[PDB]
A and B are shown apart, each in its own frame.
Chain A
Amino acid sequence: ARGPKKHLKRLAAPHHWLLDKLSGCYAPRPSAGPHKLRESLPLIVFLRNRLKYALNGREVKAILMQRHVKVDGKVRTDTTYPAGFMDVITLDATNENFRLVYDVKGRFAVHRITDEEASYKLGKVKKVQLGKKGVPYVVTHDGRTIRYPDPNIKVNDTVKIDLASGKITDFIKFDAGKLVYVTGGRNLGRIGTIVHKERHDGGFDLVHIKDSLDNTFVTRLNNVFVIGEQGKPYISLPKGKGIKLSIAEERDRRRAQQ
């Protein structure tokens, strides 16, 4: 390779970005950031082909350098800034916040909500360990680390970050009967009230997740992300509620209520 990869082409970019194969040969490559290369949505493409607010790369970059938008409470004037799942980006113009959530079909859906949901967000703990000077800490999916966590937080948990302070207001653990969000694989964007788990000592645990339609499926432990307790959510569910309806029923429901 002789070095790191600095370019990305269309048809070689992840599917959920929804880039047309014409009108160019290269894709907006996200540089180092809080989220993975594949499981993230760059700000430029997000502004371009999801809101249609801007129609040019030059106009998008000018918007970014004029400090008219900000991410997670920070301006972050990066022309290809990557913002992935559970990312909050508020807009001072009309003060509308967009949460980058996953739709039922498996693409980066955008949810427009108000200032309270802009302030409060959710994160998934990746690992919990002890740093230098006997300081314990955690790792989140977006890198939003909080120092000195409460000792109950273990791996595969979820926390609420106020985006302003460094204190975890709410924490939700991992057990049977919890509202979850599968982020990975073919079930991208499904809520299925986790039932049980097969550990399979040695790694690669499996979790049985069943939607309200009693559609039960399985997923890797690395893909499930608990988002709240049964009933009420911690964050607003996207349109479709993550059901993944059968093909005949979905098609005739589109035909009826088109």
Chain B
Amino acid sequence: SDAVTIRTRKVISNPLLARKQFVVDVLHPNRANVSKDELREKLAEVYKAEKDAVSVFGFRTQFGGGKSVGFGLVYNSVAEAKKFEPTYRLVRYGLAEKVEKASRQQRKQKKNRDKKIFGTGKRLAKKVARRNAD
């Protein structure tokens, strides 16, 4: 917004992962809260790269508020950002979504059952149904 003096330091530009990673320093005295979307779009508008090219996390707020420090990385393009950013991070940002599945215990039990079952199981089910019928 106005006089937010949000800065980035220790910036390194690595074409290996094709990004620019740095520590973000946010000074918001007498300000209620800065959100993840606000911070990312502000870093985007000051780095003139792209709105979704920037990704910020961490955001440890110093004791008593007023100042916060985090990590921030800007990709050269949305394609590289999607390729390199973690799936959970993309889901948290909204750039991606992972389809809900069964819980760990349930899927492990499914794997136990179909590891006990040998073969496809269609023939076994047909034989069981035939035996039940007769």
Residues in A lying within 8 Å of B, measured CB to CB: 52-56, 58-59, 62-63, 68-69, 91, 93-94
A201 to B34 CA separation, bound complex (whole angstroms): 74
Q: Are B17 and A94 in contact (CB under 8 A)?
A: no
Size bracket, chain B contacts: under 10
B12's partner among A52, A63, A93 (CB-CB below 8 A) is A52
A149 → chain B, closest Cβ, in Å? Answer: 38
Q: Are A54 and B86 in contact (CB under 8 A)?
A: no
Q: Are B17 and A63 in contact (CB under 8 A)?
A: yes
20 intermolecular pairs with C-beta atoms under 8 Å apart: A52-B12, A53-B14, A53-B16, A53-B17, A54-B14, A54-B16, A54-B17, A55-B71, A56-B86, A58-B86, A59-B84, A62-B17, A62-B84, A63-B16, A63-B17, A68-B16, A69-B16, A93-B14, A93-B16, A94-B15
Q: Are A93 and B86 in contact (CB under 8 A)?
A: no
Within 8 A of A (CB), among B1-48: 12, 14-17, 21
A93 to B16 CA separation, bound complex (whole angstroms): 7
Q: Which B residues are CB-close (under 8 A) to A52? A: 12
A172 to B37 CA separation, bound complex (whole angstroms): 62
A58 to B14 CA separation, bound complex (whole angstroms): 16
How many contacts A-B (CB < 8 Å)?
25
B18 → chain A, closest Cβ, in Å? Answer: 9
A108 → chain B, closest Cβ, in Å? Answer: 20
A78 to B15 CA separation, bound complex (whole angstroms): 20
Q: Which A residues are CB-close (under 8 A) to B14? A: 53-54, 93
Interface of B, helix, strand, loop or mixed by DSSP: mixed
A60 → chain B, closest Cβ, in Å? Answer: 10
Ranked nearest first, the 8 interchain pairs of A and B with the lowest CB-CB distance are A93-B15, A53-B14, A68-B16, A63-B16, A93-B16, A53-B16, A59-B17, A63-B17
B127 → chain A, closest Cβ, in Å? Answer: 43
Task: Tell me whether A53 and B86 are in contact in the complex, defined as CB-CB below 8 angstroms, given that A59-B17, A63-B17 are known contacts.
Answer: no
Q: Which A residues are CB-close (under 8 A) to B17? A: 53-54, 59, 62-63
Q: Which A residues are CB-close (under 8 A) to B16? A: 53-54, 63, 68-69, 91, 93
Q: Are B12 and A53 in contact (CB under 8 A)?
A: yes
Q: Which A residues are CB-close (under 8 A) to B21? A: 55
A53 to B84 CA separation, bound complex (whole angstroms): 14
A126 → chain B, closest Cβ, in Å? Answer: 34
B92 → chain A, closest Cβ, in Å? Answer: 15
Interface hub of B16, B21, B71 (most chain A Cβ within 10 A) = B16
Q: Which B residues are CB-close (under 8 A) to A68? A: 16
A11 to B17 CA separation, bound complex (whole angstroms): 30
A62 to B18 CA separation, bound complex (whole angstroms): 12
A66 to B16 CA separation, bound complex (whole angstroms): 9
A78 to B5 CA separation, bound complex (whole angstroms): 43
Q: Which A residues are CB-close (under 8 A) to B86? A: 56, 58
Q: Which B residues are CB-close (under 8 A) to A94? A: 15
Q: Which B residues are CB-close (under 8 A) to A55? A: 21, 71
B134 → chain A, closest Cβ, in Å? Answer: 52
Q: Which B residues are CB-close (under 8 A) to A53? A: 12, 14, 16-17
